[PDB]
What does this fold into?
Amino acid sequence: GISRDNWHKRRRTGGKRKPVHKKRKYELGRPAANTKIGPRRIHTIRVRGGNKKYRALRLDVGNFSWGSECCTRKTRIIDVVYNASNNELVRTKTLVKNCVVLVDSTPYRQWYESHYALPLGRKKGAKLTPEEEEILNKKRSKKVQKKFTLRRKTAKISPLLEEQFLQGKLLACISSRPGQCGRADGYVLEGKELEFYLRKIKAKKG
Amino acid sequence: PVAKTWVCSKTYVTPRRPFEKSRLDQELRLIGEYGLRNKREVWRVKFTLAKIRKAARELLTLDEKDPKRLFEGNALLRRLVRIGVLDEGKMKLDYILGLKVEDFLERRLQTQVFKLGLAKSIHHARVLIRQRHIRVRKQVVNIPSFVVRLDSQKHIDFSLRSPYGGGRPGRVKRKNAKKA
Amino acid sequence: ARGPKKHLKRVAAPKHWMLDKLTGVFAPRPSTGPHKLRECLPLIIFLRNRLKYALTGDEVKKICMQRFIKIDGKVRTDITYPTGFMDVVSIEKTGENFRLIYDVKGRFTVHRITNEEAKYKLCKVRKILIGTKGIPHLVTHDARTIRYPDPLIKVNDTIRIDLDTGKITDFIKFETGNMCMVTGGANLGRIGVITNREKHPGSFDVVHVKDSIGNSFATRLSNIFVIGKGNKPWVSLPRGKGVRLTIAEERDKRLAAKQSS
RNA sequence: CAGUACGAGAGGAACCGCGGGUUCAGACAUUUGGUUCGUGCGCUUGGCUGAGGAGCCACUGGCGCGAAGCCACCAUCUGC
RNA sequence: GCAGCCAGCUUAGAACUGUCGCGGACCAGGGGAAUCCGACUGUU
RNA sequence: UACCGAUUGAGCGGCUCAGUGAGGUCCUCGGAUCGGCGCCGAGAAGACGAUCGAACUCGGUCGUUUAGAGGAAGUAAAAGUCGUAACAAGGUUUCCGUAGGUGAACCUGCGGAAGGAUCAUUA
RNA sequence: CCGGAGCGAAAGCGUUUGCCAAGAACGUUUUCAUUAAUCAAGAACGAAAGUCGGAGGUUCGAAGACGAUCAGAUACCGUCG
RNA sequence: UUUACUUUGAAAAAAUUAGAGUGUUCAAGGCAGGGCCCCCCAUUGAAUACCCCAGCUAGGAAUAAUGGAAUAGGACCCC
RNA sequence: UACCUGGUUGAUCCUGCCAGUAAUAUAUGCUUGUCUCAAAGAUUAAGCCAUGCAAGUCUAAGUGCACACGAGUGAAACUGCGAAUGGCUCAUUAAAUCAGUUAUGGUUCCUUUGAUCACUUGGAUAACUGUGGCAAUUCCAGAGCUAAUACAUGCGCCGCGUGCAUUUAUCAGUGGUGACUCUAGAUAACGCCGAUCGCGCGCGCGGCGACGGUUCAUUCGAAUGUCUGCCCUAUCAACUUUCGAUGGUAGGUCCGUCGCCUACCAUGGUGACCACGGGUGACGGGGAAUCAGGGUUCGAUUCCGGAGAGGGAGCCUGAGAAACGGCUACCACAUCCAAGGAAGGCAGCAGGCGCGCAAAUUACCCAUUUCCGACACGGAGAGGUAGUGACGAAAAAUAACAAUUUGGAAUGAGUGCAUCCCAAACCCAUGGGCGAGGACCCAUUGGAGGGCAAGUCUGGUGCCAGCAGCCGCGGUAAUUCCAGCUCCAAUAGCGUAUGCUAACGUUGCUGCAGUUAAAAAGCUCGUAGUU
Ligand SMILES: [Mg+2]
Ligand SMILES: [Mg+2]
Ligand SMILES: [Mg+2]
Ligand SMILES: [Mg+2]
Ligand SMILES: [Mg+2]
Ligand SMILES: [Mg+2]
Ligand SMILES: [Mg+2]
Ligand SMILES: [Mg+2]
Ligand SMILES: [Mg+2]
Ligand SMILES: [Mg+2]
It folds into this structure.
């Protein structure tokens, strides 16, 4: 079937080489990932040596991490916004490696408020209506309030990053290979890498 | 994949000129002098001599201080003086080039039994071995082309089962006795 | 070419066996084991050819099927066991304790009882692999796995382990001056003293070994098998450690001994 | 009938009976196929009514399917 | 060194899409291998 | 014995253009069914799409093998006819290149060459 | 005059005068300082005949006509071209 | 400044060939056996050469290239 | 042994080729008494095949109610493993295979070795008993039971805990490397932990084994890359990409690297130092033949590596196959049908046809050699042995000792018994016995003009028939032909045909030639190349 051999290509000089033997099994190929966004559909593939490989056909959740801080929370992948390889991997909504996506920001804010106790993704003007969010602005013990003071001094995230918290969609990037690993892991953009893709999204959406 | 050898070499070489008038008599003279069957045996002993001459020739081209020449040269000399074709006094590769065809013809078993008087003539000496009479150290030899060594030269005698030696007579002796 | 090969022709066998080309076509392919196929000796040969205690290939099966041979004390049943270097072959039924050690040339000799020395062997370490939580590992000569190594041992030293407990008793550091038995061709069995070690970044390293009579030479770093600390070996050696009598020297001994017998 | 009569063979009939066909004649449309300006329905190019919707125009705009009729040894029936 | 503003009309590429249909009407060369005669365009 | 040769050649064979495409894999689905027991599970036939791709029908190109009316050479035969071109000053010195002409070898012009019959011809 | 003399890479080159830009050899305590030699691919030149396009066509003269010779000359010889 | 060149060693399958060793009755071959009632070719064998070229390893510096300073961003020491 | 000889002419010296000469290997001709070895359908047809066989396998140890024989070996039967090796052939293949070299820090594994590591619950099922379909197959269907080693179940954070395999992100620096984005540590997170078996004691137990999993090993090995090396062809000079050609980015894919593939960009890569294209009676190499040296030619062929199983293509299972003595199609070919269907791959071992100049027995057995599995037991056309065999190679008869033709004396070849041999048989070899005087138990094959060793011998045949590799022999006294005798290199071999090597310094690197014998471009410039 599909093969990744070299005896079917042209030589470096440009001359066609004749095949020394027929297609072998140890050089076979398999179809592309084309990992869409869907609930828990993964096929197992028996590979060279009796091992197992996990084929991710559609995945909705992603175990992304935060760049600036130390936070790794699994979040629901929403959609793809841009891909440097081709705009076809975003028009068909295929989850591959090194593609910037707009992932949810609810697990990121849930841990930021429980650690820093500072409102970041709150709407300018609106207050915290549910009672579960007022517990992050209470009076704690002496050994508990002392640690939150040294954490509040270092919390000023970049203005280009706090904007996405308002819409709940953080610009993340799939840093793993879904078709091979079976998991759409990755991280969240920050710093210069966040400004680079935002400029490409602005030009593509302009 | 068969468990065999496929290793075999030739023992004679056909001369270049097929009707060289000078060569035809030189080989025919060795025929009657040593009692040989045909010219193949002359070319056979001539080929063995040609191999020893060429083996000694390539050694003489090397330097004397070469351990390969010292070891391989002495081993060739010891084998020549062992069979008796070369004397212990002239134990040097320079004397190998002076060896003639008759030097190896003398070490033939059918000739040694002629020098020892065990046979009447050189042609009867072949039939003497052809009829399984001559033995070498209690080991009987039937082919006349055997080559004896110096440590086995003084042991050429009749077999313990031959009529010419000590034992039963031949079948013709017993045939004429029962009919008389 | 579709998978693993399971036959071995007789003419394709290693020369260290000296098989008869006019009896069979195939050689005894040594069963997979701790040693390389090129650096071992099938257990059938050592019991049929070397020791001559077996006459055919079915009689040597009756040796292992009666549980008499035991390499490193453990009785084996495969008549084609590798039985590589330093492999103690003890025979408790016959009291014989053989060690397959090389001669001045490259061959497997019949080295007889070494009871007080046969209870252990020497192993060349290959790599120092780190396990979990910082637990290093050492791979020995005959595939024996020893864990918890001393931090002073390197990837080139040798160690001694008892056949029963299998623990490192003593080790010999690798440096210029250690007794060695070179292995790897054209020096297989030449016992001498290490003198120098050349360094080559990115390739093999060159080491020089000097024998008893000063027969100094050179070889790769992967060819050193340290056998003694300084100049004293641990286990009994065969007739002629590393003297390597030349063709002329061997010639002198053969003529002087046969004339007396 | 019949591989029979006939024939030395090679070869090789006929009457009755049975099943079909050629040519022709007279019909016929259930079926299949053709035709369709029932301009029947769908789609569609250019244009036109501001657009949607609904339509029209291009001597039947074009295309697909197509009823009824008519029609074909190109379908079917009958012929003493 | 560009930011702002203004201005069209073409070209290429891609997705999606309908009955694989799309120069949808209209407009709009069948082609090839040879022979004869006159060179050709023109003229009768 | 080869060559030329209409035939719009051709038995003969390889990579390929464009079509069509079995079969398998994969994917999207399908849900015959039996184990629970009216919801979770397994689940064949079969189907969309993708992909690999045999093979077939037409072409392009390359290699290779062959038919051919007829035409025109070469060589081997007998050297038959014609004339004498060359070999002695071969009776017009030979020969080269080139061109034209002529039954035929050849003739002639122009420029050469001596492999010429001149190594030489007189102040 | 013109020769077993010169020149040019060869083919080739000789009436006078003028014009034009080259070349060997020699001269040199000048200058440059190994920048070479031979050279597939590539190129200039290349007697004569021939070819295409003009001028001029004396002489010669392929072809061609004719005159002689011969058994026969479609040639040598001759006129003419 | 580094190459080409020569020498040494490991590597440069076995078989074959060259070739040490051995009386397969000899030889082609084989890798095996002469002799003293469980020792004896000193726990009977046993070696080697060659393996081009290229790569690899340790010298030499002849030959032939190459190359360090000329608008000295020159070699050394400074400070 | 570093070798030449005949032939141009009236004669001579040369150039020069032809022919002569000797091995080599295929065929063939005639001949062929013994022994030991030994090639043997490669060449044209990798053309096509009747029949049979070539992988199955059971131990005290996963599961044991055929009563056939009587607890126990048990036949069948389910589970495990092998069948991916070997063998065959050389079609394909010209930097490809292959050879040396070596990289995987750019990769995985069955067996083996050494590690290490929720009181056994669940329901079928085969063999079998029983009922049947189809002309037929290693076809199976329906029902009824009955097994599993088949299948399924001492801290961080902050009250109070305690095994992990992988995937990303972040921080720090145990054992290493020439060099890790290595092996380790830590942070935030995200299908491996034994429901199994044998021979066997004491009184809630232990000491002996197998099988099997988890990540690291090892090993038998695979797979893909670095450097170097291929014959012929320029009447193949430019080549490679509107479908990857070269490179760049990201990703996909695979065990893994990579235009392996996709997408965006650059216009690259190779090439006279021979690319590309074509041809090969091309599998590569180790090697073979011939050679003073230098070389020439050959290598299908038992070893290694690769390739293929009619042509392709695509897969299943498995650790490992794009497997064909396994499947799924198409193509080519072909078999049995009851005409509905079914089943096919001898370039495996024998054998047949065809093809040809060209190549053996439908033979005997697992003993050696070893290989495969549950294994001491069972299996192997792999292999071993024998038959056929003038491929070829090594030994070696057809007399000898006497007499002037007759005496014995010595021995097998052959022919008949034991033993040895052999897994059995067989060739020998051995012990005695039976066994040669035209020792008829008899040797032919090319020759006898020269080259080139041997007859102006004998008779007829008369430019006829023929001989002759070459020059040449016959036109009525042929040393050639048509025959005898004799003789000669011979010799159990010897001629013939063709390939090839030396001869050949007639391919000349060593080592040829170019004034007149074949030959320096008409002349000069000129790059690469060479110096
Ligand atoms: Mg109708
Ligand atoms: Mg419209
Ligand atoms: Mg509308
Ligand atoms: Mg109008
Ligand atoms: Mg109209
Ligand atoms: Mg219609
Ligand atoms: Mg015409
Ligand atoms: Mg006209
Ligand atoms: Mg015209
Ligand atoms: Mg006109």
Residues 5-11, 44, 55, 58, 68, 71-72, 75, 109, 132, 135-137, 139-147, 149, 152 of chain B lie near RNA strand H (CB under 10 Å from a C1'). The beta strands of chain B are 134-136, 139-140, 156-158.
